[PDB]
Amino acid sequence: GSTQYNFIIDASAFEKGLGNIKRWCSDCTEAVTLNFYIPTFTLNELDFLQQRRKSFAARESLKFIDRLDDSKFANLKVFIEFPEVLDIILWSDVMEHNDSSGKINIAKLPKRLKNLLKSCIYKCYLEGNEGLHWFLISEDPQIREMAMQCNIPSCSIVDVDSILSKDMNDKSFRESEKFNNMMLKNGTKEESENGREIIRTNFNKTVYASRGTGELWSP
């Protein structure tokens, strides 16, 4: 396909969302082009989880990354970071994108997280950009908070899965879109104290979601 997503994927995204990522690679590369960048942080953190925490999801993620790097798949690009790039990227280049008013003490972060920020800034703003728009995929709130402070756009696995369902135009996207427009039609829009988009609805008027057809597991 002609639409292209450019992602830097962290370790938590693999450990928690490996099944979702596998589906993106095999099914979604029809009308979408996926472009992954695997930083050194990811490989080191997945190795730590597999060895010190006996995480079988982290073991499977490392095996999957090897399969991605060995295959010449259509509409899927994967680049594993060369560790020596971390010594070339300036920490001052990361600090130029950091919000001073931000609550996180960026210079006091551990080595692993300092290097993850270097990888992100390299892709988002430096030589690794290639005229593309990059997003960090993470399932760790601390990682997403530090990325936001350094103007690195980030998303969750669910955020990407929803975006790729829209492009694929599957029944999951279409039926959720009907539900959204049903709420917009019957219900009052409000800006909550949190700043969020809330829709007041009547408790007594409920919309049920069509299930469609499908196969159930049987013993």
Add this chain to the structure above:
Amino acid sequence: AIPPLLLRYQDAYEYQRSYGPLIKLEADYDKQLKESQALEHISVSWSLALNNRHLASFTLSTFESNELKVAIGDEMILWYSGMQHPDWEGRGYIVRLPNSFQDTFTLELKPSKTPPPTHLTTGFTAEFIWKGTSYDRMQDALKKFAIDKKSISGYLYYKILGHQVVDISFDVPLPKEFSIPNFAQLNSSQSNAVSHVLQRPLSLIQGPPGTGKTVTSATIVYHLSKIHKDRILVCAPSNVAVDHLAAKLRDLGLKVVRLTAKSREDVESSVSNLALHNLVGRGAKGELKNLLKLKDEVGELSASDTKRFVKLVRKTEAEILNKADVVCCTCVGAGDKRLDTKFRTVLIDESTQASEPECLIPIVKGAKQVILVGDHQQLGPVILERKAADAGLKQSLFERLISLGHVPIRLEVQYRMNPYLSEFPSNMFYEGSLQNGVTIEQRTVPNSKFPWPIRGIPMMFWANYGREEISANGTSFLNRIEAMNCERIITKLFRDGVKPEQIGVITPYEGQRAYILQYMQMNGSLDKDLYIKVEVASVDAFQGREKDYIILSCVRANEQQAIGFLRDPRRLNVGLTRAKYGLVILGNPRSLARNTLWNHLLIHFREKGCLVEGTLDNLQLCTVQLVR
């Protein structure tokens, strides 16, 4: 060939295909385990129940207490085969389960033409009859969620699937005051929780230890009952939690109906006056009143009277369940045939102690609004099958919703323990948010003579340099020096006037539990009868409960600095939040300090001046080097 648990599911069919095989794995493992247990040779002690039925008591040594998923009311067959009497079989029901003090199960035998061989003690085997009802309901709930569009609202369906749909709230009249008049006032944390929940289709409440989740949950149910003017379904994985919540709801003036299985109708309860079967019996008149009296004195009914009896009971049960303000039952109990009606508002307490398919059972009854109460920082569900647990069945619905971005509202004022005891658990597991609802003066003993390292700080980490041993099974560890030190602590508490009921000993290893119990019986300074009343168990036994004094025996001490499942943050959290007045931790800091969680604990104890070593009467600061 099983699909992994995903973050977002395409549809509820994929959701079912993921959880379905995991339920089967658990079911098969549970069933197979009981098949093996049926081969163990047991000793039976006979007695007579008040109703004059025979009681068979016995100990099952093959499996650990947590591995045998046996409930009161469960049917069993007791078999004799030997050279002292012909072959004999007897069917009965479980009336007592093992506790910390009683290692025995008690089976009440059904009356028969052939009497039981009460003169024999050995030659018996016990076979639990497999029902599978709990797992069947979980499977049915998964399937109903997939194919029945009316089982749950569209919004909740999308939220459970991990989909991104616009957030909605209910146009509902909020009360001016959240605390209920004529009743004890909620604190601001509790009040904020009730406030946040009332207009949301889905809420998560986190209730740390001693923070008042019962009064908060009962107040929520009370307001939702007044707002919707409809039945509310209230659930929890365990019967004790259901009874606790039902009692509070009844105290608020709500018409509560407590549904128990037909198997447990004779179980002793604090809320027996709310049991559906007792409400049928008491509120019966006419033909039903007669059929009940007849069945009580005759013990059996004729074919025509049984059909008539069943018809009338069902009709009465439905009328009682329909007129109720709240229906209370366990999560699995929600799947009962008698509750095949609609429940639009559901509150699930202790939802973190159930698997996701177990929580689904009460939610697939036409739910529009769901409140899940729990604590992912405390104990999770019991998953016997490791492959199923590894595949993700240990994750509750409360925890998956957190991974999906749902922030729980936390109750932050604890009323259980001395402020000194709540500090580390609060900082470590609750981001330092816990405040104290009780003072140091409310949790102190004025004339205490106990050798606490610092007077006024009722905690200590008593370092010992003993080494772990291996028990008679080969599968467990013990620590003879820590067991000896444990007795010295207890005796010292006894000398200070503390009663055995006030003391609890928590140890992760069955080897240590058995050794501590035996050791205090033979080498306890004071009367052995005092020490037997001191509860020695694992964290599971103390989950949801409290003691005035807690002794933690870590057991683990080796040159490799390996500590096994002492690594568990959730177990450590529960073990540190059980005490009200005092805490003593026994352990070897040298090996515990390699673990980063335990290293933070030792540093906290050292900062308080509580990390000590030596003789109890001449304690010294522990010399171990701790490096962060």
